[PDB]
Each structure stands twice: as C-alpha cells, then as structure tokens.
Design a binder for this molecule. Structure first.
Ligand SMILES: Cc1noc(C)c1-c1ccc2c3c(cccc13)C(=O)N2[C@H](C)c1ccccc1
Ligand SMILES: Cc1noc(C)c1-c1ccc2c3c(cccc13)C(=O)N2[C@H](C)c1ccccc1
Lengths: 129, 123
C-alpha cells in the first residue's frame, strides 16, 4: 500500500520562457500521430502519468527517473510547448522505453506498448519532411 | 546483374524454434520493419537499379531484413545468435561500403539503435 505523495510532480506542460514554435511537423504530430494513438484500444494506461499510489507500485519511481506519458505529450502539443518535432518524438521514445524498462516482456502492458509503438513508427513514416 | 540473394531455406541445416528466435521475429524484426528508415534494408541491395558496379565486388556476404524475415518465418536458424549475426552483417556491410556522412549510414545508425534497444530485452 503506497502512501500519498509517493508520486513526483508530473512533467511540466507549460513554460513561458522556453522557446517554442508551431511547425507543419508538430501540427502533424498532434492532428495525426497523437490522435491515432490516443483513440487506440490500448492507449488508456498511457493517457496520464503512472500513478504509483493508485497502482500500488512502491518501486516505480525508484526505477523510472524520467517519466513520460501521452497525456503530458498531448498537453505539450496543445500548449505548443516544443520547438521541433524531434523534441516531441523524444517524449514518445521515453514513454515507450520506460514501460519496457519497468515491466517484463510477457506483461499485458508490454503487449499494449508494442502495439502502439508499431503504430507510432508507421505514422512517423508520413511525418512531413 | 545482381547475384542470387542469400538462401532462406536449407534442408541440411540444423534448425530449431526457440523463444529467443520467436522474439527476434515478433518484436525485433517486426518493429524494425515499420521504422521510417527501414525501406532500403527490406530487400537485397539492387546493384543494377542503383548503378553500383562495385557493390558485390566489395560485399561478399550481403544481408538484408527481407532475407532475415524469410529466414525467421522459415525457422532457418539453430539459435538467436545466427540471426543476430545476420543483422550485424547487414549493418557492418552498410558501414563498410558507404562513407560515414552518407544518408544511408544515418538511416542504418538509426535502425541499429532501435535493433540494439530490442536486443537488450532478449529473454
Ligand atoms: C503504462 C505503464 N507503464 O508502466 C506501468 C507500470 C504502466 C502501467 C501498467 C499497468 C497498469 C497501468 C495502469 C494505468 C497506468 C499505467 C499502467 C493500469 O490501470 N494498469 C493495470 C494494472 C493494467 C494491467 C494490465 C493491462 C493494462 C492495465
Ligand atoms: C542499404 C545499402 N547498403 O549499401 C547501399 C549502397 C545501400 C543502399 C544505399 C542507397 C540506396 C539504397 C537503396 C535501396 C537499397 C539499398 C540502398 C536506395 O534506394 N538508395 C538511395 C539511392 C538512397 C539514397 C540516400 C538515402 C537512402 C537511399
């Protein structure tokens, strides 16, 4: 039973002094890539930061030091928080590798992440040049 | 003309299914295949179409993910290491033939990073 306050603050989704832009690529990231992944049947555990209290995982944030989730990525894209598509792609990469680090190849959550990862790579193929 | 591609079947070769070989098809190859830079590596190097009269004068152990795919689907390998060697061959062939600045090399480097990330999790 994991106590209250065991979760770190979520990753920031706004920063007035960070330089940022809207680009054709970042707009495609929101309007095609994030949307396609969000609506997927396996998206839901990834739609918000991992809640180690609710999930009773006293080890999660002892192992994962660079948390990321699609809810954070969504808010970032909506807030035009990124300078370029690569910064956003790096957040997806973080989300996936975190899952693969914390969990075990047989786990349901891993099957879900592999599904979304393949979909992700497919949608990145048509990322505007 | 191009040489015949590498073999994907061989009745005399010792063969097994292992869980590691199944991981190589289901996770490693099937993730890599979807990557935006996978396409040049999905079939043998076509030296006629590419006008590379030196390619098969230099590369004598060609390999590609198309060959690897077929080999995994055909249960061609005895252990995961033979398949891993095929990937390593494909990558080093690219690095051998090309110059470090080349777009194909950056593509290769991206794919090899993903490949290593998946190999990291071999059971
Ligand atoms: C994603 C993710 N990355 O690391 C972990 C742990 C999760 C995770 C695993 C299992 C979860 C969740 C849930 C919400 C958010 C993150 C996670 C959640 O409800 N579960 C349950 C226990 C679950 C089990 C099996 C498949 C899907 C969800
Ligand atoms: C892979 C690979 N390994 O050695 C060579 C040469 C290649 C190769 C280089 C450039 C290619 C291809 C193509 C298909 C299959 C193999 C290769 C191909 O269409 N190109 C074009 C010319 C190309 C130029 C720059 C980046 C990617 C592809």
């Amino acid at each position: 039973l994991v106590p209250r306050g065991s979760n770190p603050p979520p990753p920031e989704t706004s920063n007035p002094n960070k330089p940022k832009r809207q680009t054709n690529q970042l707009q495609y990231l929101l309007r095609v890539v994030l949307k396609t992944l969000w609506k997927h049947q396996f998206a839901w555990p990834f739609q918000q930061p991992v809640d180690a209290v609710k999930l009773n995982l006293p080890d999660y944030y002892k192992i994962i030091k660079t948390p990321m989730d699609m809810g954070t990525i969504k808010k970032r894209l909506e807030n035009n928080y990124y300078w370029n598509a690569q910064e956003c792609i790096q957040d997806f990469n973080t989300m996936f590798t975190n899952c693969y680090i914390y969990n075990k190849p047989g786990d349901d959550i891993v099957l879900m992440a592999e599904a979304l990862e393949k979909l992700f790579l497919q949608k990145i193929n048509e990322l505007p040049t």
